[PDB]
Amino acid sequence: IETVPVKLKPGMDGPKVKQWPLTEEKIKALVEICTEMEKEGKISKIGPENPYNTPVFAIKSTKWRKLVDFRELNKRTQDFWEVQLGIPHPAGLKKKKSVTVLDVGDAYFSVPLDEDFRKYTAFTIPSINNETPGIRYQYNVLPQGWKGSPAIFQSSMTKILEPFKKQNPDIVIYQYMDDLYVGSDLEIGQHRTKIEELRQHLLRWGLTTPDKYELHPDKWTVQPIVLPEKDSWTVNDIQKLVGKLNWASQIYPGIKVRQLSKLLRGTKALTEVIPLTEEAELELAENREILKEPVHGVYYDPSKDLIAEIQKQGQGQWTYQIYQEPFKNLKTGKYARMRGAHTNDVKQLTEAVQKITTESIVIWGKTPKFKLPIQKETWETWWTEYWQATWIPEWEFVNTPPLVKLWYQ
Amino acid sequence: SPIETVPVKLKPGMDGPKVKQWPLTEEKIKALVEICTEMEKEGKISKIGPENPYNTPVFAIKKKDSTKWRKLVDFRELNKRTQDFWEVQLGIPHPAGLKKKKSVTVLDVGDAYFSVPLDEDFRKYTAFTIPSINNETPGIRYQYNVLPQGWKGSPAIFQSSMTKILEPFAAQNPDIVIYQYMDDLYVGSDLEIGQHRTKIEELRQHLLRWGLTTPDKKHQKEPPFLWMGYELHPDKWTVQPIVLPEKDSWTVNDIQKLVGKLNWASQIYPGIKVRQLSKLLRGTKALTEVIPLTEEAELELAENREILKEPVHGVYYDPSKDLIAEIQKQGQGQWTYQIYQEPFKNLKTGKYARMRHTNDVKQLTEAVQKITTESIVIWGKTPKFKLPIQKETWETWWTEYWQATWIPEWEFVNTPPLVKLWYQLEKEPIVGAETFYVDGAANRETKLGKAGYVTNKGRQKVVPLTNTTNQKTELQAIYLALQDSGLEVNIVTDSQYALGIIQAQPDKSESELVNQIIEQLIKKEKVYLAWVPAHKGIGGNEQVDKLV
């Protein structure tokens, strides 16, 4: 069929990102995948007059998936293609009781890609020890990972889905890149059969989905801060409490601590149990109530970017906050990975970055930029080992630790 | 040659170079036309008419002072207009990654770029002109038909032409390995020497039919091979001999040229140190300010000359044997490592240095990371690690560290020095221990400061300080509380900076104050540090900020 013309933003030139070094095992899995794709016409080999490049990786099951990092090309294209060809985000998806994620990325491989645009999709399969120049392909069809793919395929998706949308005016469906998020309110058993319906409706219209993952966004809120509950209080407990409550002042204004600062007037020893005054207890109860209520004036701004901060807490427990301006949390959570010591730190941080991204997609229709507590090179090396998603969020690496660790636990 | 051309464009919205052909001396104007008739006859150029409005300067110079003159075209004005090409190979293969082969042959193809055609529609933008004597006649126009010397697209277009020309031969010969590099081919194989030599001669005839020359009488080189500053031997590899200059006066320029050779030799010579010699160049701007060799520096340079005395070698890679890497700590944020498969032969060696006052364990992790990255690039896998650190010592650190840290397969190696946690603060305050309420402060203008403390038992001190910041006094206050307390002390500071440096559990720093604090923390038995907001009227702290 005739191809949708695609143009870059005026003045923007194609991506030119370097290809990371890969394990031999992964390099072979890629050469195998690509020899099969060139056979089916999805990609073709190119010459040296193609100067652009885009990193490729090998993820996983037992089959090797190929993941193309299209983050750079999306900033140079999808921008004028969330504009010219945007996909609206429903504000009712976060309210449904259950939400299943269906992979429908295989639909793009039939639709051809614009002739003048293919050169910007080039990628390289690296050789070990710089022994050979490297195998270079470009795409002839809509690639997975690119955001212009679901945008171009949008009209076909709406057509294939409308028969199902009529017999289910209550089921919400949203398309982000290669995934279909469908939220219902039915019982879990009902919802699970309604999912197998759509899978069969999609399959009998030509869209296979490798299934033969479900979230619950009704609990997703901004978690309340927790002051310690103690029978007796020492001078140190009151000091950790006065410090944390002094920090909370940056978020909830209206906290009072003068009554709790007087309970430490003299320079007493650290392990000296001090009973709380009558005036003292007024604040520990008055401050535990102003803090169980959400904040005032915190609204999502769609013209800004989302920022996600994670911090390691210990024993496979991680806390995170998603915001846009400091101290204005749109969302805060707590990812815990029960693995019984069959996971490491990098594995847990990877799972969290994906649970946080999936949550962020349902609630706002876009992903946040992560500030990761990890060495840059360490992450740039082992993140593909546990990546199970097809999109890739922007990220950067935190330099200094937080003296505010226990202030989120 | 019958090679298929690569289509080339000019950068969007540009036109060919129209440069000024400045008049040249007489004896040269003759030497040029003597080449352009031998290069035209061989089809590499072609006289053109007047329709061509572009041009490029042309010069002439002698061949290292010899018989044949050499033509030279300054394409710098045309390179600025041609489109970008795929970047040619950045790095080169490392000898430690190569696999032992029964025989190796080096083939240098001469005239490389001239043996490859140039896209037709792009040949006009290479037009040039030879000057008529005293502007008497119209200029002898010309233009290239092959890839010109020193053109933006020549190296990349030649590389992809060579690769295609090898495809029909590599398919009929799946037993021989060919690596490419600029104008060179490196053919390896496990064929008996009689076979190998026939394959090489038939590879030459192949390349010869495509119009590419190669050495015949006797291959230009024989092992060992002096390639890219290496010595490649049939069963070992080493760096070309290093020459450390004996000089009684160094320059900021020559320390860079010396630290270079030292880093270079460090990939196979174990033990080379460069911390003291690169410590000189920290405050560098000018290039010729003569530098005193610090006494400490001179020792390192003497210890390097001792390591370089006898030569050492590295082996080649054997994919069938495990890959092992071992790490040793040199001393002052200086680490060394060897990568090997056998006990008496290393694949290669190297060193990690930490810049940016961290501790030993975190430095070790950073080193394991540097080694893991290099292994992938060279051999495509990560090695097993023998590390001089107790498993329990490491589990304690990464468990309480705020960053995620990956620890690949490793086992303990009981070889001093060892990596250990020299001290650990208490997670909960101590009982029966004195509680010091330290604080500090200085003056940014005058740089006069003071530190002190106030304990619960009534003890108090205040010390004057000159030439300090409102930061060094915060550490001076904690040092005071550590000198004047027993073997168990609780400290309470109102400074996140100090609490941050101490909670970072460093074993060395680039400041002498922190080293004395570490010495005290070692001597102590239980030390609980604690933080409270300043100037909040808490208590215990409100009375110490008034003293200072």
Side-chain angles (χ1 to χ4, degrees), chain A residues 1-35 37-257 260-264 266-278 280-285 287-291 293-338 340-409, chain B residues 1-29 31-63 66-67 69-135 137-215 217 219 221-284 286-355 357-469 471-544 547-548:
Chain A
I1 316 171
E2 257 314 315
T3 75
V4 173
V6 185
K7 266 53 145 185
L8 279 296
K9 161 188 163 183
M12 289 274 180
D13 189 60
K16 303 187 178 182
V17 186
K18 66 120 182 179
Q19 167 57 50
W20 300 95
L22 303 165
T23 298
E24 176 183 18
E25 179 193 36
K26 270 125 164 192
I27 293 163
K28 273 204 273 273
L30 283 181
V31 165
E32 197 169 27
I33 287 177
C34 294
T35 284
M37 301 183 72
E38 173 164 44
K39 208 153 305 174
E40 305 184 322
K42 304 203 191 75
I43 46 130
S44 307
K45 288 179 178 175
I46 68 212
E49 83 288 16
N50 191 332
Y52 313 107
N53 185 75
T54 316
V56 294
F57 307 91
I59 56 175
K60 288 308 200 74
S61 291
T62 302
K63 232 169 80 73
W64 279 111
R65 285 196 78 261
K66 161 193 151 204
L67 173 75
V68 183
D69 176 337
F70 273 116
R71 285 181 296 185
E72 198 63 76
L73 182 66
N74 290 343
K75 279 173 272 176
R76 288 173 159 82
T77 63
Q78 175 269 356
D79 228 58
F80 289 20
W81 285 66
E82 95 180 294
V83 171
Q84 175 185 345
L85 246 49
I87 295 181
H89 169 78
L93 181 61
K94 47 173 171 288
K95 307 179 178 307
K96 296 293 173 173
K97 289 176 174 176
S98 290
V99 169
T100 307
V101 188
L102 298 178
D103 186 66
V104 299
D106 181 60
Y108 311 143
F109 284 174
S110 57
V111 175
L113 180 58
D114 183 51
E115 192 58 31
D116 302 355
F117 188 79
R118 295 175 182 171
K119 69 207 203 73
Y120 304 112
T121 68
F123 57 93
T124 325
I125 308 174
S127 56
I128 303 176
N129 208 79
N130 295 324
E131 300 182 320
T132 51
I135 305 177
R136 284 179 67 66
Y137 300 98
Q138 79 182 12
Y139 268 84
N140 306 130
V141 307
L142 301 175
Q144 299 199 31
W146 191 38
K147 283 175 183 170
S149 291
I152 292 176
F153 194 76
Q154 192 178 7
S155 70
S156 297
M157 189 65 62
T158 298
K159 190 225 173 187
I160 304 176
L161 284 180
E162 194 274 332
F164 186 94
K165 286 191 179 181
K166 234 279 223 56
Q167 293 318 122
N168 300 275
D170 294 305
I171 278 181
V172 188
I173 303 189
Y174 175 56
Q175 193 184 24
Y176 191 81
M177 262 137 138
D178 312 327
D179 300 314
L180 232 64
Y181 304 90
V182 311
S184 64
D185 291 318
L186 316 177
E187 171 70 83
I188 306 318
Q190 293 194 301
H191 169 96
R192 198 156 302 170
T193 33
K194 229 73 185 113
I195 299 295
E196 197 64 29
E197 287 184 8
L198 176 67
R199 274 188 35 80
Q200 288 158 347
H201 168 87
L202 297 170
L203 185 52
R204 79 173 63 99
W205 278 99
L207 300 201
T208 69
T209 66
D211 282 20
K212 289 148 80 97
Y213 193 41
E214 59 203 330
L215 350 168
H216 312 264
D218 77 277
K219 26 240 31 275
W220 298 357
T221 164
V222 177
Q223 299 312 144
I225 312 187
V226 170
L227 296 170
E229 290 243 305
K230 299 190 171 304
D231 298 300
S232 49
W233 299 76
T234 66
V235 77
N236 184 221
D237 284 311
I238 289 200
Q239 279 183 340
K240 302 303 184 192
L241 174 65
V242 172
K244 179 183 176 185
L245 277 173
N246 183 72
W247 162 77
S249 330
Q250 326 188 263
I251 299 165
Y252 304 85
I255 311 290
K256 300 298 111 193
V257 282
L260 291 203
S261 294
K262 282 176 160 173
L263 210 3
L264 309 149
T267 84
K268 337 214 97 243
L270 272 190
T271 55
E272 176 165 313
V273 199
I274 256 307
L276 322 81
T277 103
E278 223 32 60
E281 200 75 11
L282 135 118
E283 294 294 318
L284 177 51
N287 286 133
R288 251 192 258 260
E289 283 230 343
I290 178 179
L291 170 131
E293 295 282 11
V295 179
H296 163 261
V298 167
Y299 301 103
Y300 169 75
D301 186 353
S303 72
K304 293 184 176 178
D305 276 0
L306 289 168
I307 288 179
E309 273 189 53
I310 304 173
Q311 45 264 159
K312 179 153 75 122
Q313 290 288 355
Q315 295 180 343
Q317 293 229 320
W318 304 71
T319 63
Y320 68 90
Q321 306 81 40
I322 305 178
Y323 64 86
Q324 300 185 279
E325 292 308 310
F327 304 106
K328 306 263 180 173
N329 294 340
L330 303 280
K331 174 82 166 61
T332 71
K334 152 99 54 49
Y335 176 87
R337 170 38 121 156
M338 163 40 147
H342 109 72
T343 66
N344 50 308
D345 283 338
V346 180
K347 187 198 173 187
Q348 303 181 357
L349 180 59
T350 283
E351 325 266 88
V353 174
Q354 293 173 79
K355 154 144 277 295
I356 301 168
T357 299
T358 299
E359 294 185 0
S360 184
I361 294 174
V362 174
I363 294 170
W364 298 290
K366 62 171 58 176
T367 63
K369 182 185 180 63
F370 290 85
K371 310 172 91 62
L372 302 176
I374 185 152
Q375 181 186 352
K376 176 177 197 183
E377 284 73 27
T378 317
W379 176 262
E380 288 175 336
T381 299
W382 298 98
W383 71 272
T384 55
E385 294 284 320
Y386 310 105
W387 204 254
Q388 287 193 330
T390 53
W391 34 255
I392 311 179
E394 322 283 347
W395 47 50
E396 64 184 39
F397 309 95
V398 182
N399 2 76
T400 66
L403 297 201
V404 323
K405 187 197 172 185
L406 23 63
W407 283 348
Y408 297 111
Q409 190 60 312
Chain B
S1 308
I3 302 147
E4 185 184 23
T5 64
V6 166
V8 168
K9 290 176 173 177
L10 288 171
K11 266 157 181 172
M14 298 197 191
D15 199 10
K18 290 158 180 172
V19 184
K20 57 189 185 180
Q21 179 47 62
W22 270 16
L24 251 283
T25 126
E26 255 91 43
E27 84 155 352
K28 296 184 194 161
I29 306 171
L32 279 204
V33 165
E34 297 196 21
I35 332 270
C36 300
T37 60
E38 283 313 277
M39 264 167 44
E40 172 175 40
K41 285 179 51 177
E42 291 159 49
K44 289 135 165 188
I45 32 175
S46 299
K47 293 193 303 99
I48 63 179
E51 316 80 352
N52 196 281
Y54 328 89
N55 192 272
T56 298
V58 197
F59 303 138
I61 357 184
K62 321 87 167 58
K63 154 42 186 178
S66 181
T67 13
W69 275 53
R70 270 132 99 200
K71 174 195 175 190
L72 198 154
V73 178
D74 200 0
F75 282 108
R76 91 181 269 150
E77 190 56 49
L78 178 55
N79 294 323
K80 292 192 285 176
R81 296 185 176 63
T82 71
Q83 39 146 130
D84 301 282
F85 294 98
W86 181 31
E87 286 194 33
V88 191
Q89 65 187 311
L90 287 75
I92 66 123
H94 193 281
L98 305 170
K99 298 82 168 305
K100 170 51 183 170
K101 292 272 143 290
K102 283 228 105 205
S103 4
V104 171
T105 308
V106 176
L107 304 136
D108 45 295
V109 13
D111 288 15
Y113 297 179
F114 286 116
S115 315
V116 172
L118 172 68
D119 176 55
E120 168 67 37
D121 286 337
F122 193 81
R123 294 170 172 177
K124 44 189 176 181
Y125 316 122
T126 69
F128 56 127
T129 243
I130 355 184
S132 162
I133 30 147
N134 283 307
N135 199 126
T137 132
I140 320 172
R141 300 290 271 151
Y142 267 135
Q143 81 176 8
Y144 275 77
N145 299 314
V146 321
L147 303 182
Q149 277 297 332
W151 177 58
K152 191 181 181 184
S154 292
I157 300 172
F158 170 85
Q159 180 197 100
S160 70
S161 299
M162 174 58 45
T163 299
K164 291 195 196 307
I165 287 179
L166 291 175
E167 238 144 56
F169 189 93
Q172 288 178 352
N173 293 280
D175 15 294
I176 94 183
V177 186
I178 311 183
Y179 306 157
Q180 311 190 207
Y181 188 88
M182 288 171 31
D183 316 316
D184 274 56
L185 294 180
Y186 308 136
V187 190
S189 69
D190 293 336
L191 271 34
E192 288 304 359
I193 324 312
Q195 306 224 2
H196 189 109
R197 294 202 177 275
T198 307
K199 288 298 174 181
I200 295 306
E201 180 61 17
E202 105 175 47
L203 161 60
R204 306 210 312 108
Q205 296 310 316
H206 186 164
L207 307 162
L208 184 31
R209 295 154 196 155
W210 287 100
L212 304 180
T213 67
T214 154
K217 34 103 164 326
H219 299 139
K221 293 86 152 197
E222 302 201 83
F225 302 95
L226 312 190
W227 168 73
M228 297 290 91
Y230 280 103
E231 287 190 0
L232 302 167
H233 298 241
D235 230 303
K236 82 196 172 173
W237 76 271
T238 177
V239 267
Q240 287 180 29
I242 316 287
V243 163
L244 292 180
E246 284 276 11
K247 184 139 47 192
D248 300 282
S249 175
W250 310 84
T251 151
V252 162
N253 179 95
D254 289 331
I255 304 185
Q256 298 185 346
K257 196 167 310 178
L258 159 64
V259 104
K261 308 204 208 316
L262 283 174
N263 288 332
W264 185 247
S266 68
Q267 63 185 297
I268 193 57
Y269 282 103
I272 309 317
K273 313 189 181 189
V274 300
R275 179 175 181 265
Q276 305 290 358
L277 292 88
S278 58
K279 230 175 185 178
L280 306 193
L281 253 120
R282 304 261 125 263
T284 183
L287 177 144
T288 313
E289 79 174 82
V290 181
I291 318 280
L293 330 321
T294 140
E295 351 231 9
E296 301 58 16
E298 245 299 21
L299 181 47
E300 256 187 9
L301 181 44
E303 300 185 325
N304 282 341
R305 299 190 196 263
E306 177 59 12
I307 297 176
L308 288 170
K309 262 188 184 61
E310 72 167 313
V312 70
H313 305 278
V315 294
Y316 293 119
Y317 184 52
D318 176 15
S320 64
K321 296 167 182 170
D322 305 289
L323 196 66
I324 310 83
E326 237 191 294
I327 298 176
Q328 299 90 34
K329 167 179 176 188
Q330 300 241 78
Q332 51 265 264
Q334 262 183 141
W335 301 75
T336 198
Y337 65 86
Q338 309 81 41
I339 300 175
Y340 60 85
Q341 295 167 288
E342 306 298 12
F344 298 102
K345 353 171 182 180
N346 290 324
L347 271 344
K348 67 174 291 290
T349 56
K351 60 193 172 62
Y352 176 78
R354 173 61 173 184
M355 277 92 185
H357 59 172
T358 57
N359 65 66
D360 269 354
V361 174
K362 206 233 152 45
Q363 272 190 146
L364 190 72
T365 293
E366 294 170 334
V368 166
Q369 184 48 48
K370 179 191 203 296
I371 291 177
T372 297
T373 301
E374 193 189 19
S375 295
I376 286 165
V377 185
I378 295 178
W379 306 284
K381 49 142 56 204
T382 62
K384 296 147 185 165
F385 280 97
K386 294 176 186 169
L387 299 184
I389 182 177
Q390 291 287 89
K391 209 274 191 58
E392 13 161 40
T393 300
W394 208 350
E395 201 132 326
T396 287
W397 177 85
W398 77 58
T399 284
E400 63 180 88
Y401 193 44
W402 70 277
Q403 281 192 354
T405 25
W406 178 299
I407 328 271
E409 284 251 292
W410 72 272
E411 77 174 356
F412 167 64
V413 150
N414 187 27
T415 295
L418 249 73
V419 177
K420 57 159 59 183
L421 282 177
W422 294 91
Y423 71 92
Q424 291 188 230
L425 313 189
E426 315 303 314
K427 52 190 186 181
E428 296 283 59
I430 318 171
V431 182
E434 200 165 357
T435 297
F436 292 68
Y437 286 77
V438 302
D439 199 339
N443 191 237
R444 328 216 112 175
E445 286 299 294
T446 78
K447 289 178 180 175
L448 302 171
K450 61 195 60 179
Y453 59 67
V454 156
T455 86
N456 60 320
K457 287 152 78 174
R459 208 186 312 178
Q460 310 171 34
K461 172 170 291 185
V462 168
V463 170
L465 291 170
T466 59
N467 239 319
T468 47
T469 35
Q471 285 193 340
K472 177 179 265 62
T473 76
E474 297 176 350
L475 284 160
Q476 200 65 39
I478 296 163
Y479 184 47
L480 275 203
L482 282 155
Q483 297 180 270
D484 301 0
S485 64
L487 291 161
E488 291 180 16
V489 59
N490 294 338
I491 310 187
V492 172
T493 172
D494 72 315
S495 152
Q496 40 204 3
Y497 162 71
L499 175 71
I501 289 187
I502 305 305
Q503 285 188 343
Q505 315 215 325
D507 46 74
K508 262 309 283 63
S509 184
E510 304 177 285
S511 88
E512 173 63 359
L513 176 55
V514 182
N515 304 289
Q516 316 188 276
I517 294 181
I518 294 167
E519 303 293 331
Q520 294 294 350
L521 285 167
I522 300 294
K523 268 183 268 287
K524 289 277 177 293
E525 293 171 352
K526 301 187 182 187
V527 182
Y528 174 81
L529 192 59
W531 182 88
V532 297
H535 317 108
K536 286 274 102 66
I538 281 112
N541 175 81
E542 192 218 327
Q543 289 74 51
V544 183
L547 277 171
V548 180

